[PDB]
Amino acid sequence: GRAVIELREKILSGELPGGMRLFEVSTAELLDISRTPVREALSRLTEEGLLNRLPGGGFVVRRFGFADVVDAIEVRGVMEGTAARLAAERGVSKVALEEIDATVQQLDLCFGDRVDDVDFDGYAALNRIFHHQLAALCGSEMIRREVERASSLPFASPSAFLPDKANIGAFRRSLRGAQEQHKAIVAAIVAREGARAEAVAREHSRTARTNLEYMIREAPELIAQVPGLALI
Amino acid sequence: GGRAVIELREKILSGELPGGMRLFEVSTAELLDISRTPVREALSRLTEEGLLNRLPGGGFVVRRFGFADVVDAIEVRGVMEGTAARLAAERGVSKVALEEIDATVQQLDLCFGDRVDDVDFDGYAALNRIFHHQLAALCGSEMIRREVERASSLPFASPSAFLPDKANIGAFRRSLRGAQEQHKAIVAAIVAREGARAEAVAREHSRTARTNLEYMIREAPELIAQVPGLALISD
Amino acid sequence: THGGRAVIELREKILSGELPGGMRLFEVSTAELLDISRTPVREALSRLTEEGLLNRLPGGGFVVRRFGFADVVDAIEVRGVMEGTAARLAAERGVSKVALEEIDATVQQLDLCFGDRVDDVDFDGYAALNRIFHHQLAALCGSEMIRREVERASSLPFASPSAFLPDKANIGAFRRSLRGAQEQHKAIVAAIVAREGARAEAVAREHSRTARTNLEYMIREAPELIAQVPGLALISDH
Amino acid sequence: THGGRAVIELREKILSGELPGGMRLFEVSTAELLDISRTPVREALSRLTEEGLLNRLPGGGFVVRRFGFADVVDAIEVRGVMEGTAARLAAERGVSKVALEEIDATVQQLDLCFGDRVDDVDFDGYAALNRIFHHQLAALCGSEMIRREVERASSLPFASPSAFLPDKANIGAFRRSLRGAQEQHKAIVAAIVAREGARAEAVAREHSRTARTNLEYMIREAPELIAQVPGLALISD
Ligand code: NA
Ligand code: NA
Ligand SMILES: [Zn+2]
Ligand SMILES: [Zn+2]
Ligand SMILES: [Zn+2]
Ligand SMILES: [Zn+2]
């Protein structure tokens, strides 16, 4: 319920920092909520990967460094590469293929005549749809939920490195190449080219890594706009 | 908490608590005859393990599995183990971690005799668990170790799942020779910084469990009941 | 040399379709047709067999090799596979400071070909520097055998890295495609520096799909460009 | 034919190391050495340049190509990469019922070369059937260009499937066993049937990568033997 939302907000803002131990009574007091919803909130946020359970009881706010962000992006890329390869090997229905191709055609409409001209917000929304469609493309529920789970951490999400404030020249310029990769993923799946589909979908996740590296080096003010990046 | 986890897992895997059954901490506490505090932890831990799903309106639901789920889970474990192998090959491995896994590989070789059938199956199964735990931790990333171990958390996704004690038969002992050659190649590829090879061999290695599953279905159906949760699957 | 001149002339006659696919060639008849001595012709026939433009027949003579669209696509695929091999081996084995500095310089020069508009691309400069980049990539791991085999896989007129970048292909659609191709050049070098062999191989192999896309664009949208790629106009199943 | 006999004799002399790497060969002096006419010697020297055993010199004539241990390893690497490509393309494009039946028959026949003990292996039977399996794999996708390039990548004596099998057998050089090699043959076919291109490429590449581990063990651990082995004696190191 609302206990999950409030607790999640306090973890993501760094208010409850990594390594902080949390107990049902002391957390219920901190949030000013009953123990029953707090119990559910602590357990749900362990399942989400924001907290770890301690031996002997209680919870601890999970610590994330830059290396964890890079590894989580790498795991999303590996899992998205798996969804793409399995769709290419097993085949995709006419309908599912038509839907993902429609999203790709829609994403092309985000790009103007100059290298800088990109509808950043439209791209970010359509990009989420494309990645959800790719995760479900092979028709396996197990694959879909594992791909979605690898994309569940705030900084591991496909549109995590495209926040509203990152609508700048350098990030927009990068989206052209990223969209060419969306097209190649679909073309490889259609052609039953599993190795290519996996290779492009895995490489595509290096765009978020390259963006993260740009935020660290050239635009540190952007770090705070990425969900989860306030935890680092 | 841990005892509640064990008992609840047993009741799900036996089909006593069938797929689609809604569970609550009060009714589960009553059924297991355990306090609600350990039950609450057991329900949440078994959601993380993938045996239960949380319901939006409260409570939990026992997850249902088909043959396709078993095959996909093994595929995901192999993909993740392939990732651990590639990252250890690209990033490098400490002298100590390398010495430890190599010791496991040397001990695994001692399980094989002169005849194709002469195989210490039980020794192999125990050392195989160690080898796969060492591989998950090899690159030194806690995030990778955690995600590889999670991928191996389903009863049928585990590296040892398709090596139950009763599967100690000719056909299985013969297959272990090639599986051991794959363990050696994984370590050799990592040492040589050959990431593409390390990933390819570790991913292929997981196909051994898929072949074992297919052998159980077609040639030895009596073995199905030896793999946790496999007997419940109807397709 | 007399041998090298016979090679040039004979290659020109094969690529123009003057000596069509399936035509049987012998020393005497080739020497007569080129109006050159038998000694350089013998060398030219053997060198063009090694290049893949002729096949040896059981009997001492040769035959002009016939190519279809499937051959063009497979040749580009083999180049991408071999360039992916050169990239992976450079990433696994390591690259010398000097070789890395040289290929980084080519990548930096290639970036200078791109302007502010998606269309603003120095096409001719890109085509020349692209050849250098691909020669440097073939030699990057330091193996002579690998360099030799990668170069051979890039030896057909339509399998070469700048085959699908003829001077007349300097049009909007091609200039826009070069931006993504250059990002791939950068990623190949970055993956090699990071010892990321799987990534290096994946990007280098994907990079060769740019030529395949250029080919498909020539067939569907710009048929006038087909005749600009050596030997392409001969192919009847485009 | 006179030409073909000159090719065979010259190839034998290069492979044995009798004509070592770096040795310059000229038409008249080579014709005198082999005791053969001018016309067949021209064909032999040109054919062996096309095969990659000789290189042409800038001023005219030929030179026996030098191969060191690093060249052997790189040639096997190129072979594995090309065979991995043949396997992946067969898996992606699909194979006919007939071609699949033929290659599966070869795999079943290869099982017949194994006895109850690890050392109980019919090496000569295995070598012959293995060559067939690799020829069938190269042609499986139906592309003449791919078939041709895979065969070219497998043509150097030390990169050829089934090369030096009795020699490896003598010294226990099957570090990756022949049973493991046969399990890889089965997995290649199974991956192609299943349209699993990434798996087919990975297993076919590993199949050759492990063949190089075996040949490395031999060259390094048996130097006293390789100087008498045709196809290895020519190695310069
Ligand atoms: Na409950
Ligand atoms: Na309800
Ligand atoms: Zn995307
Ligand atoms: Zn294992
Ligand atoms: Zn290029
Ligand atoms: Zn073989």
Residue numbers in the entry:
A (entry chain C): 11 to 242
B (entry chain D): 10 to 244
C (entry chain B): 8 to 245
D (entry chain A): 8 to 244
Reproduce passages from the article:
Here, we characterized Atu1419 as a transcriptional repressor of its own repression in addition to two other genes (atu1418 and atu1420). The structures revealed Atu1419 to be a member of the VanR group of the FadR C-terminal domain (FCD; Pfam PF07729) subfamily of the large GntR superfamily of transcriptional factors (>93 135 members in Pfam database). Like FadR, Atu1419 possesses a characteristic molecular architecture, composed of a conserved N-terminal DNA binding domain containing the wHTH motif and a C-terminal effector binding/oligomerization domain. We identified the short palindromic region composed of 10 base pairs and a degenerated palindrome bound to Atu1419 and the N5,N10-methylenetetrahydrofolate (MEF) as the effector molecule disrupting Atu1419-DNA interaction, allowing the expression of the second part of the HCA degradation pathway.
We solved the first structure of Atu1419 from crystals grown in sodium citrate buffer using SAD method at the peak absorption energy of Zinc at 2 Å resolution in the space group P212121. Four molecules (A, B, C and D) are present in the asymmetric unit and form a tetramer (a dimer of dimer), which is consistent with the observation that Atu1419 is a tetramer in solution. Remarkably, the four subunits within the tetramer are not identical: molecule A shows large conformational changes as indicated by an average root mean square deviation (RMSD) of 1.28 Å for all Cα atoms compared with the subunits B/C/D, which are more similar (average RMSD of 0.7 Å for all Cα atoms). This is due to the presence of a citrate originated from the crystallization condition, which binds molecule A in the effector binding site in a different orientation (orientation A) than that for citrates in subunits B/C/D (orientation B), which bind similarly. In molecule A, the Cα atoms of Ser169, Lys175 and Arg183 are respectively, 0.92, 6.84 and 7.34 Å away from those in molecules B/C/D, allowing the side chains of Lys175, Arg183 and the NH main chain of Ser169 to interact with the citrate molecule. These latter protein-citrate interactions cannot exist in subunits B/C/D. Nonetheless, all bound citrates share interactions with Arg86, Tyr133, Asn137, His141, His214, Asn221 and a Zn2+ ion that co-purified with Atu1419. Thirteen polar interactions are observed between monomer A and the citrate molecule (orientation A), which is buried within the monomer, leaving only 26.6 Å2 or 8.4% of the molecule surface exposed to solvent. In contrast, there are only ten polar interactions between monomers B/C/D and the citrate with a similar buried surface area. In the case of Atu1419, the citrate in orientation A bound in the effector binding pocket induces large conformational changes from the C-terminal domain to the N-terminal domain. It affects four different protein regions: the wing of the DNA binding domain and three regions of the effector binding domain including the C-terminus protein which is in contact with the DNA binding domain.
